[PDB]
Design a protein around this ligand. Sequence first.
Ligand SMILES: N[C@@H](CC(=O)O)C(=O)O
Length: 401
Amino acid sequence: MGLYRKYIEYPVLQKILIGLILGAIVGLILGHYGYAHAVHTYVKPFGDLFVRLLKMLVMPIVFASLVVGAASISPARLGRVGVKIVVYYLLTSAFAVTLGIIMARLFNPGAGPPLVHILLDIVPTNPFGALANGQVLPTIFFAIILGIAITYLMNSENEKVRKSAETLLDAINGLAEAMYKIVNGVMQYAPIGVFALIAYVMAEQGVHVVGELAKVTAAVYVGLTLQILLVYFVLLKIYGIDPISFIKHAKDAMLTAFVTRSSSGTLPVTMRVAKEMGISEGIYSFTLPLGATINMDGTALYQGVCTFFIANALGSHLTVGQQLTIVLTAVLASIGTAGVPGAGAIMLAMVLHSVGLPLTDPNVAAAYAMILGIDAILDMGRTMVNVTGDLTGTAIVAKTE
Ligand SMILES: N[C@@H](CC(=O)O)C(=O)O
């Protein structure tokens, strides 16, 4: 076709980066000349199509890949990896949100759920209904249950049941391997989408990011970088794995999660960098699709610093906010959020409705609107630390096995 084949000749991460750079440059130039409605009605629909594709991909890829993932064995490896991976994700997410409580105290703010039905909603009251209407967490539950039942059926004695279980597992594996090819097809289109998205985001609200609300995003970025270098480095340093080689060996997945702003949009490159890391296929194949959508350390560290930006601009106080329930509801919102770009803001609204200062006041929508505008640049570092937390967990359970 001509220049199209040269466009599918470049490597991907030497192209999404040039899209981000030439999006931020043209966004700043068109923000210095006041073309904000021009970008918002001409260039932003490409980024909205990109976000539409990354939302489309998440629901088959969290079901079929997770059913295939729960086919190592039923008892031993699955049980031990399950317990020592969910408690690992819980401690990493809780340490991230208590770092967020630690943050915005050395840093500054910017001036200018019935508590058991949330856990009972994990069990889906209808599996196809909880697969249609979003609901990533009950889809995860039903997918793990179906995987365990399929790996029980494959060890049966009747030949017809064995053939039927093998055919069902091969069908779901065909869907889970077709969704990765659709991910590759989307991430070929990705530089146009990230160009449009960062162009609009730098144009509309990002023109004054460094003037005011610079200390909140400085708090987010310094907290995420210190989260990396003070949790993941020490967790690789406990179990005897050199972590600078871990960054230089997983920088592929780190960078594509940094630019595409989706944890579940970087699942194939995270799987290929685990195999290029050589973790082992049977030991990552369950915990990477689980960890892609059950632990988000970026949103966990992000909800605390967002609630401290809102509550310390014009809010009640910090100890009247009762930070322990902020930690708990932020861990729950990190667990229950999806892997799309603009996901954690809605769960942040859920956190604020659940802990205090709900979204009805005339001085809470004005603080939330600025962070809804600036959410798109924080999503980058959020998904970056999420995918490298997944990779860190896979390397840890590679060590203790
Ligand atoms: N972008 C995050 C969610 C968020 O921070 O809004 C994810 O893909 O999981």
